[PDB]
Amino acid sequence: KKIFKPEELRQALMPTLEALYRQDPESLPFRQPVDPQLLGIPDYFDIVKNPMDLSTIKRKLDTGQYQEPWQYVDDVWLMFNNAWLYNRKTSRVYKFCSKLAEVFEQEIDPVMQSLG
Ligand SMILES: CO[C@H]1CC[C@H](n2c([C@@H]3CCCC(=O)N3c3ccc(F)c(F)c3)nc3cc(-c4c(C)noc4C)ccc32)CC1
């Protein structure tokens, strides 16, 4: 039973977020919030109720909004889940999402090792 102290957590989690950002081009569609007006997809917020993206995860990590690892993981998962939900499996964005989820599953493992 491990309970992370706040700044040990930020230092534990930030490398996993940097690993997502470092995927180029795969992280590019995820670096800023989806703007349905600019992209001419007005149904986006009908399907994606709770948007999430790397810039929002970064800001939340930087402002102590993740008190335990599972809250951070939840938001990362949410940004993947939204992208798989909204996009077709053949699309670049969908395949890029899968690449990032693959990276995340490797990079989050040491933190998970510490918890269990
Ligand atoms: C850096 O400026 C950005 C790059 C990605 C651009 N983009 C693009 C542009 C549109 C024009 C065609 C194209 O190839 N884009 C693009 C550009 C860079 C990419 F890495 C990429 F995978 C796709 N499509 C986006 C889709 C999404 C998306 C997500 C995430 N979930 O549901 C949807 C819909 C998000 C961003 C998309 C928008 C401007």
Residue numbers in the entry: 1082 to 1197
Which statements did the authors publish about this structure?
Many proteins, including the EP300/CBP histone acetyltransferases (HATs), contain several targetable domains. EP300 and CBP broadly regulate the activity of other proteins through their protein acetyltransferase catalytic activity. EP300/CBP are critical gene-regulatory targets in cancer, with existing high potency inhibitors of either the catalytic HAT domain or protein-binding bromodomain (BRD). Using crystallography, we identify the binding mechanism of the EP300/CBP-specific BRD inhibitor CCS1477 in complex with the EP300, CBP and BRD4 BRDs, and define components of the CCS1477 catalytic binding core that are required for compound activity.
To understand the structural basis for the observed differential binding affinities of CCS1477 between EP300/CBP and BRD4, we next solved the co-crystal structures of the respective bromodomains with CCS1477. As expected, CCS1477 binds through canonical hydrogen-bonding interactions of its dimethyl isoxazole moiety with a conserved asparagine residue in the acetyl-lysine (Kac) binding site (CBPN1168, EP300N1132, BRD4N140). A major difference, however, between the inhibitor binding pattern in EP300/CBP and BRD4 is the involvement of an arginine side chain (EP300R1137, CBPR1173) that interacts with the difluorophenyl ring of CCS1477 through Pi-cation interactions, while establishing an additional hydrogen-bond with the piperidinone oxygen. In EP300/CBP, an analogous tryptophan residue is not present, and instead the equivalent LPF shelf is less bulky and facilitates interaction with CCS1477. Superposition of CCS1477 as bound in the respective Kac sites reveals an altered binding pose, reflecting the reduced shape complementarity between CCS1477 and BRD4, as compared with EP300/CBP. CCS1477 produced a greater thermal shift with EP300 or CBP, as compared with BRD4. Further analysis of the binding energies by isothermal titration calorimetry (ITC) confirmed significantly stronger interaction of CCS1477 with the bromodomains of CBP and EP300 (Kd = 4.0 and 26 nM, respectively) than with BD1 of BRD4 (Kd = 403 nM). Thus, CCS1477 displays preferential binding to the bromodomains of EP300 and CBP, compared with BRD4. Since recombinant CBP BRD was more robust in biochemical assays and crystallization studies, Kd values were determined for all compound-CBP interactions by MST, and co-crystal structures of the CBP BRD with five of the seven analogues were determined. Thus, the difluorophenyl group is a critical moiety in the CCS1477 pharmacophore that facilitates potent interaction with the bromodomain of EP300/CBP and is required for efficacy in cell line models of G3MB.
